[PDB]
Automatic annotation (TrEMBL), chain A:
Subunit structure, interactors included: Component of the gamma-tubulin ring complex (gTuRC) consisting of TUBGCP2, TUBGCP3, TUBGCP4, TUBGCP5 and TUBGCP6 and gamma-tubulin TUBG1 or TUBG2. TUBGCP2, TUBGCP3, TUBGCP4, TUBGCP5 and TUBGCP6 assemble in a 5:5:2:1:1 stoichiometry; each is associated with a gamma-tubulin, thereby arranging 14 gamma-tubulins in a helical manner. Gamma-tubulin at the first position is blocked by TUBGCP3 at the last position, allowing 13 protafilaments to grow into a microtubule.
Species of provenance: Xenopus laevis
Residue stretches spanning the membrane: none
Section covered of the full-length record: 382 to 476 of 666
Signal peptide (from-to): none
Function: Component of the gamma-tubulin ring complex (gTuRC) which mediates microtubule nucleation. The gTuRC regulates the minus-end nucleation of alpha-beta tubulin heterodimers that grow into microtubule protafilaments, a critical step in centrosome duplication and spindle formation.
Protein name: Gamma-tubulin complex component
Automatic annotation (TrEMBL), chain B:
Species the sequence originates in: Xenopus laevis (African clawed frog)
Domain of life of the source: Eukaryota
Name of this protein: Gamma-tubulin complex component 6
Function statement: Component of the gamma-tubulin ring complex (gTuRC) which mediates microtubule nucleation. The gTuRC regulates the minus-end nucleation of alpha-beta tubulin heterodimers that grow into microtubule protafilaments, a critical step in centrosome duplication and spindle formation.
Location in or out of the cell: Cytoplasm, Cytoskeleton, Microtubule organizing center, Centrosome
Entry similarity comment: Belongs to the TUBGCP family.
Section of the entire sequence shown: 1600 to 1695 of 1698
Subunit record text: Component of the gamma-tubulin ring complex (gTuRC) consisting of TUBGCP2, TUBGCP3, TUBGCP4, TUBGCP5 and TUBGCP6 and gamma-tubulin TUBG1 or TUBG2. TUBGCP2, TUBGCP3, TUBGCP4, TUBGCP5 and TUBGCP6 assemble in a 5:5:2:1:1 stoichiometry; each is associated with a gamma-tubulin, thereby arranging 14 gamma-tubulins in a helical manner. Gamma-tubulin at the first position is blocked by TUBGCP3 at the last position, allowing 13 protafilaments to grow into a microtubule.
Length: 72, 81, 436, 436
């Protein structure tokens, strides 16, 4: 499915059950991050990325600029 | 009170809990005491639950009130038959 | 104002309530007539509901114990719980009658002790605020406990037509016939009262008790004598919404009401998980609640004889999942979130089924106040596999010749045997009819 | 959630998988009960990958053991790890058997024990999140593994077409003719299903097994007990991209997709460096990682007999060199610089070949995190020698007039012997055509 606003919710619960039957190596890390898939190519593939938080003041090393350089 | 139900005090989830109450009086008054009138009382209940399902689906946003997650348990129930 | 009179009746029925009352003093951690801890009032916030409050420095059970052998209740005298019971108010210390083992002995002994048998449960209620009901803690095993208890399944729902009937039927060992050989007879007569002179039932199979006692408690020596130990534990588990408060279904008729679709279906499979011993070497670091309800939607605790391809050719219709005590109550809804993704739940292939979760506290008592506890009070349509076991051992007895005349030595002197057969095949079939 | 069911079948097929399950418990550091090592979860990031998915911290081999010979399986249930095994989803405790030692014994017993042989892999695939496949740990020795093993080579190709097939075909010493003589007949019926109803085999010969057993473990007189350590190590060894995450060809059908040019050529030769106790002296400071694949550039450790002079009339097409544990990997790109310069492995001249290099993490258990390891999964076209070797032992057996009517009293009553000859020559032409 080319990206749309409801495909966003589908990829969130999909990463949820997928990483959960494998058992993610830490059980409380699973609901503090998820993947997030907004313009459409023709496919959701190679159009999805990561959403994960950051803590005080670890963010000056992990500034919101360079998380894009890794995501691209 | 956000956690309770909330319903933004206006939305048809508040109309379905009002309306399923209106059939509940027909259920106690017929059973305390008409068989075609029994089955109509729950055909209206089946109207009201199928009305609820389409409302859950337009509330589904990506995460929006802790009742939503628990409602999608029942949605996938509905999918299972 | 929810006072329940337990009607413990029979050789086993007196034993499963003997260890039920004994379970309550040890879980509240007090003397059965004293107070030696403050967990009695702090843990249990309704100390009287199956007792009455102190006025003589002693606890008062709301119990009656009648049987046709005086031996079982004198084996309650022998034990030092004569300062928890009263052998002139709470039991008749030496009550005789039949030999007995006939179902027809006790069924005719309730009707010539008809005047006395309702002035002992209605004299057992005499300061009560108002009655909830009666629990008939009676035995199907033998003809004694089954014989008089099946008469009270009728007279208590029309002399009190608004009070609760629900039975703890316990069967005699189905791997014997040399314990009681009138067993297919005394089973089915009561099963006629279980579908139309009842309301809800609890049927407990005995061979599934010994299946669990050697696989979850791991004793080497499977015998018929673990009958009362696994039962007394699930009895005290079932009423943690009446002896400790609830919230919704804050009555016992709350749980039991939603597990009855139609009359003739209400036979509840009981499960109780804390019997595992490998969950107790990992209780220092707190065991998890994320895989303890994959034991209530998958077999690992059934005390009901049910097949292994009857957990798929039949589904849950109503399933109740009672979590108790310490449990970590903030992720029990997260645990129920991951059930639907695997599909461990089973639902009917037509309309509504419902996975109810509810919670309730308990008093200090480490196997369910420091470890996750899971009680299942299920409602599965796979209950005909037992009704085929009782029918197939019943007609098998008539080609052996036995109790076609040896049952008619007292009371029964008219034919009504193919009348109990015909109603039973009506039961087994309408259940299969009720779903697609 | 990549669960493989090992199917031990045959007399030699039960002895080689016995120490395979015994290697896994010793490296995961676990007890047959619970966890006693936290290297169990930090070292193995996927404990369950051949084991039952725990829900009370128990691990169960997903093993099935059927065999017509009770002598080999009675040494499995008298083990300390006979409690790791449970006789209730695996096997019976004191299991039975057929004649056996005939291909027609075990093929016909395959289809009247047809219910339980396909209801014992689905009693080990009920917590499964998708099955990877089946590994047929079957013998080529005797009629026992080969009769019963020819059956499951068929039904897993059509009741289970999606699922992966891969076998550990183990030959006995082919020069026996007085304890087994029916070995070229029972071999070829199984060799025909292996190339048309199976995708991959892992070949193993015995004369190159005793080749290691006298120069790497060093006996003066051979034993077949220095032959079961060599197979059980290479079994756990193939799964270090799957029991512990990979990245690319992290699936086991990933390794095999790049190891199979096309069926008609798929027979993988296996090689294993740390079988000797003189490779723990080359990891006290770490010996260089340049030389651990230039010993697999021309083998000298193969569990497949072949000449060293049949490497210049043949050309490797796909060769995998899986390195394991601490090897200090940073001069490993230097090791592929030096491969083209020696050319002891000829590469095919119709087009490019493939030098596959891998690394894998493993637990901190001493022989998996210290010793320098080279695991070879070769695919060399000099394998046509083994097929010429079993066919030369058949055609000699038919001119002694043996099994022209002695093997066709049971479940053979039609010609199929020249079908075994022809199907061997198409396989033999198509191995050699892929370097032509």
């Amino acid at each position: 499915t080319p990206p749309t606003a409801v495909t966003e919710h589908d990829v969130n619960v999909a990463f949820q059950l997928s990483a959960h039957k494998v058992l993610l190596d830490d059980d409380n890390l699973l609901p503090l991050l998820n993947l997030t898939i907004r313009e459409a190519p023709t496919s959701g593939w190679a159009a999805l990325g990561l959403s994960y938080k950051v803590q005080w003041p670890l963010h000056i090393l992990f500034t919101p600029a360079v998380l894009e350089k890794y995501n691209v | 009170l956000f956690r309770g139900l909330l319903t933004e005090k206006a939305a048809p989830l508040m109309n379905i809990i009002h309306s399923i109450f209106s059939l509940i009086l027909k259920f106690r008054l017929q059973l305390i005491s008409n068989f075609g009138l029994m089955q109509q009382s729950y055909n209206t209940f089946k109207y009201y639950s199928d009305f609820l399902f389409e409302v859950v689906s337009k509330l589904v946003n990506r995460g929006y009130q802790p009742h939503l997650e628990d409602f999608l348990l029942r949605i996938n129930f509905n999918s299972y038959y | 104002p929810r006072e329940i009179i337990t009607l413990q009746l029979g050789q086993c029925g007196n034993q499963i309530g003997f260890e039920f009352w004994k379970q309550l003093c040890a879980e509240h951690g007090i003397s059965p007539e004293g107070i030696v801890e403050e967990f009695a009032t702090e843990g249990t916030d309704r100390k009287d509901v199956f007792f009455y409050q102190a006025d003589d420095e002693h606890y008062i059970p709301r119990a009656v114990l009648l049987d046709l052998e005086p031996r079982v209740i004198h084996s309650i005298l022998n034990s030092p719980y004569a300062n928890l019971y009263n052998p002139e108010n709470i039991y008749l210390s030496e009550h005789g009658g039949g030999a007995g083992n006939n179902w027809a002995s006790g069924f005719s002994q309730g009707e010539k002790i008809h005047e006395d048998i309702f002035d002992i449960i209605d004299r057992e209620a005499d300061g009560s605020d108002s009655l909830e009901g009666f629990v008939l803690c009676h035995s199907i095993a033998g003809g004694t406990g089954s014989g008089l208890g099946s008469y009270l399944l009728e007279r208590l729902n029309d002399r009190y037509p608004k009070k609760l009937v629900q039975t703890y039927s316990v069967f005699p060992n189905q791997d014997e016939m040399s314990h009681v050989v009138v067993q297919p007879y005394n089973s089915l007569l009561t099963l006629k009262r279980l579908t139309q002179n009842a309301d809800c039932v609890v049927v407990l199979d005995n061979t599934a008790l010994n299946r669990i006692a050697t696989d979850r408690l791991h004793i080497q020596n499977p015998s018929f004598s673990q009958i009362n130990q696994l039962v007394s534990t699930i009895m005290s588990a079932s009423t943690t919404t009446l002896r400790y408060p609830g919230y919704m279904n804050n009555d016992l008729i709350g749980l039991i009401a939603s597990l009855i679709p139609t009359p003739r279906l209400h036979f509840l499979m009981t499960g109780y998980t804390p019997l595992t011993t490998d969950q107790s070497v990992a209780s220092v670091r707190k065991t998890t609640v994320l895989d303890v309800m994959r034991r209530l939607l998958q077999p690992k605790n059934v005390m009901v004889s049910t097949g292994r391809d009857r957990q798929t050719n039949h589904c849950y219709i109503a399933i109740l999942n009672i979590i108790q005590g310490e449990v970590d109550p903030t992720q029990v809804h997260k645990s129920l979130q991951r059930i639907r993704e695997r599909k461990l739940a089973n639902f009917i292939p037509w309309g509504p089924a419902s996975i109810q979760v509810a919670l309730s506290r308990k008093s200090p008592y480490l196997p369910s106040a420091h470890r996750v506890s899971g009680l299942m009070m299920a409602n599965h349509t796979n209950i005909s596999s037992l009704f085929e076991r009782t029918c197939r051992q019943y007609d098998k007895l008539r080609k052996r010749e036995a109790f076609l005349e040896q049952f008619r030595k007292e009371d029964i002197f008219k034919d009504n045997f193919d009348e109990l057969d015909n109603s039973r095949e009506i039961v087994q079939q309408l259940i299969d009819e009720y779903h697609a």
